[PDB]
Amino acid sequence: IREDTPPGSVIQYSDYELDHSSPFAGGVAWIEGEFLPAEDAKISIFDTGFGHSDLTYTVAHVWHGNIFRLGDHLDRLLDGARKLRLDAGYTKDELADITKQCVSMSQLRESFVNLTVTRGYGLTHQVYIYAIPYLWAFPPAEQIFGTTAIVPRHVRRAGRNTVDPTIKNYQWGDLTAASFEAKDRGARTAILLDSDNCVAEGPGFNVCIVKDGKLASPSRNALPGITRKTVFEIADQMGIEATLRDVTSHELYDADELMAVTTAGGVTPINSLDGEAIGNGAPGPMTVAIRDRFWALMDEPGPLIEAIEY
Template sequence: MPQSRFLSGAAYVDGRVTPLAEACIPLTDYGYRRSDVTYDVVSVRHGAFFRLDDHLARFRASMQALRLDPGLNDGDIRAILLRLVRLSGLREAYVAMDCLRGAPKPGLPPHPLNCRNYLAAFARPYVWVMSPEVQARGAHLIVADVPRIQEASIDPTVKNFHWGDLTQALFQAHDRGADTAVLLDTAGMVTEGPGFNVFSITDNVVSTPDRGALAGITRLSVIELCAELGLRCEVRPVTVTELRAADELFTCTTAGGVMPVSRLDGRIIGNDRPGPISAALRERYWKRRAEGWHATPIDYQETAS
């Protein structure tokens, strides 16, 4: 049985395990002061991780790209995540892993090379980027005025905390009565939204941007599901004109799965409900998850202390 103090979530920070509400990091660490951190998020459903190895591989690639090394191998990180979920007892969970750069070591110049790196992670009840109610009626999106940070400055394939543009887009969506937003790059091409990848469907062909966006694990799953359903899926440049004229739109993320869209900039798509292909992909995604697709079952009977 989970220990009562971990029921709302469990955290690991630099070797110490605590209830999530008690977890903290030093204010002087570069991870906090400079957003010098990378992260990844994996979900647990029906008591099993989904595509855990894929998430660990992406996390490792992000750490290497940012020259971060917590001194732990992938097996160590896997064991920490499993321990946190066991401690919480959660069967449906949102599990995050962060690698942060600490403060410069005493007596050394304030350069990132002189900062120790460490791991922080936590497990909490599952988080929905869009509520099931919003998904059922289809999300309302806008195309944000703020452009996505340029790839030359921030690599979008490396998960990071540089959310300034995404945060502005969320406020713009709120001000315009929408649920969330999609951002364009400086050339006017579609990239991604705050925490999700974007797909358009035109003439039964599913398309998603090939640049300016995270190589999402759920995005990869959608591409696989399209193959299962016999749908043509293209990873290529997507223009905003194409997005606005699409027959269907949907988004996808770890924290929500496949999430259909019913309006873009106030324009009603289809019949103002999730389109048939989007709905089929959403249903297929959760059905395959329930069947154990790409699952890593968690043994909750193992010692969690």
């Protein structure tokens, strides 16, 4: 339900308890039209979403009982499903209700919410939704005090003309390989390049590059992330020039600050690349400012958040 976060930091779980009388408490899956406890969530082994990874998905997070940019996530999910010739069979508004209901029944005030649309089995396409406890791409301690990264010697991000990274997918072959190479080298994570040695993204996150007070993030071989979108709105409001563009490998190694951004955990400072400190090897000023603002958004009433009705 929760884990430790650095005391006094901008990241704090809610203070509450699960009603264990309900089998739904702690995790809810909506599979084949029926809500289920997450423990029982199962799909046909013959779904081509398994055998061909023929699917797309999105993840929205719930923080302090508020779901963040669910409308943006449903647009991205439906747009990508259309690009894959997938028909969800539900309108966006319908999926929002089902998703909001999934969280409500879970009782999770902090939640990792996944909506998956697969090609299905014999051919009718399948929608799977689940809301489970919050998952961290990087532990909360690293959201606060920064993480470490390497660039893989042996791996590149798949290009948009192969397994298209601009559609959010489960095909992590390169991301998994890069992660193992990171652990092998004693790093927490990897930043992948594309085939032209431009920055692509990391396993499960976009990368933002700070140089001379400007913010850049890869435009081509990267998911158009909702967190990155949010980060760019924050930067804009701070009067920071933020640009989606090609970021070369030169720029990556030369950065003043680096950060990872993804729904599951927000904005993570990246303290070192290939063992070399970025800046002073601690979270950079813009990263701290953007991250603190990002977590404030989870509590400020406005169009980005919607209260779950528990």
